[PDB]
């Protein structure tokens, strides 16, 4: 097998654009960039075969840059996807994020907002789990959902909006999370049972008990399924508890709700902030 280092050196040698007098006799530089990209791809496949995933990702990145210089934007985007792919397998989250960003830009510029949305959702996942950059993850999820909506994909936009609303509520943006939950409810009318609940919870984290009651009433009247659901009773109990300012009653209702339907960390955080808001009210 050829030495990947020698291949990269040859690609770098061929990747130098024609300058000065030579430019008047040398053809288009696109072919040189294409050859350099092919050499980089070969070296990078050799590296991946050796499980040196980070070097292979760097070599795909160089090949993608050369392809961009050659005008083959689609090949550059595919190679960037390959760079992200191997960086993620190699544990290099930052380079993976960068590769996804270039691939997303290339795809969006070519009208493939679908690919952009898929990779934006993956980028948001990477940001949320690997780098803990929750704001960028929220932005990525919101954008991915919006583009998916522009493609009439109700369910992916609904998934992206679920992620966006979850992170936004966990991030202190309760009103925006409730708005996204309303959007989810409207798109999903005709997940809803929980949506209503979650929305109300967010409205209750914002101390807007009246809005939570309005949400509960809307859910009860619009969706027969939600009206008799345990989630509706739990939301009504929480609204009543906040109205009477009985934190212990809210805790009892939470334990009762947990006993039949296990709570998740999102709900734990929302209700903890609500109880701490009661404590602030107590101050």
């Amino acid at each position: 097998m050829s030495d990947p280092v020698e291949l990269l050196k040859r690609a770098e040698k061929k990747g130098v654009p024609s300058s000065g007098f030579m430019k008047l006799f040398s053809g288009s530089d696109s072919y040189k960039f294409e050859e350099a990209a092919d050499l980089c791809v070969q070296a990078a496949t050799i590296y991946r075969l050796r499980k040196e995933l980070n070097l292979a990702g760097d070599s795909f990145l160089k090949a993608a840059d050369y392809q961009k210089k050659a005008g083959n934007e689609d090949e550059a985007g595919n190679t960037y996807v390959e760079a992200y792919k191997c960086f993620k397998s190699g544990g290099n989250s930052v380079n993976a994020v960068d590769s996804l960003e270039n691939a997303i830009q290339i795809f969006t510029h070519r009208g493939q907002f679908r690919r952009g949305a898929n990779f934006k959702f993956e980028l948001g996942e990477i940001l949320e789990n690997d780098l803990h950059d929750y704001a960028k993850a929220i932005d990525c999820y919101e954008l991915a959902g919006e583009w998916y909506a522009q493609d009439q994909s109700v369910a992916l936009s609904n998934k992206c909006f679920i992620k966006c609303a979850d992170l936004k509520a966990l991030d202190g943006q309760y009103i925006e999370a409730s708005d996204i939950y309303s959007k989810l409810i409207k798109s999903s009318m005709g997940s809803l049972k929980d949506y209503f609940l979650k929305k109300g919870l967010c409205q209750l984290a914002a101390t807007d008990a009246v809005a939570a009651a309005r949400t509960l009433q809307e859910g009860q009247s619009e969706d027969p399924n939600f009206a008799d659901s345990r989630e509706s009773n739990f939301l009504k109990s929480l609204i009543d508890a906040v109205n009477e300012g009985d934190s212990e009653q809210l805790s009892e209702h939470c334990k009762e709700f947990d006993n039949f339907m296990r709570l998740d960390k999102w709900k734990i955080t929302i209700l903890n902030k609500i109880k701490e808001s009661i404590q602030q009210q107590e101050d």
Binding site: T207, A209, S277, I278, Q281, D283
Partner: protein, 89 residues
């Protein structure tokens, strides 16, 4: 002395009380630019409270504790109307 005071209505936001001492005093903490010191002010023509100067509350905002909100059924950031009050009249 309540004889002279600006009775003009103001719309003020309900916010968390600055601290436990102010809540204990049960006095509406207002900025000097909001209203004079130690005068009775009515809110929504129903809820009467004594004003006390407080530099920690910016002008145009009114502080309440949990019990006052429970009495009025108000949430945080809710807008309420405040005017001068004269019980004697």
């Amino acid at each position: 002395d309540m004889t002279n005071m600006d009775t003009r209505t103001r719309h003020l936001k309900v916010s968390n009380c600055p601290n436990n001492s102010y809540a204990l005093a049960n006095v509406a903490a207002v900025s000097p630019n909001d209203f004079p010191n130690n005068i009775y002010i009515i809110i929504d023509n129903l809820f009467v409270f004594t004003t006390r100067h407080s530099n920690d509350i910016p002008p145009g905002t009114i502080g309440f504790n949990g019990n006052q909100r429970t009495w009025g059924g108000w949430s945080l950031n809710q807008d309420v109307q405040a005017k001068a009050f004269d019980l004697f009249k």
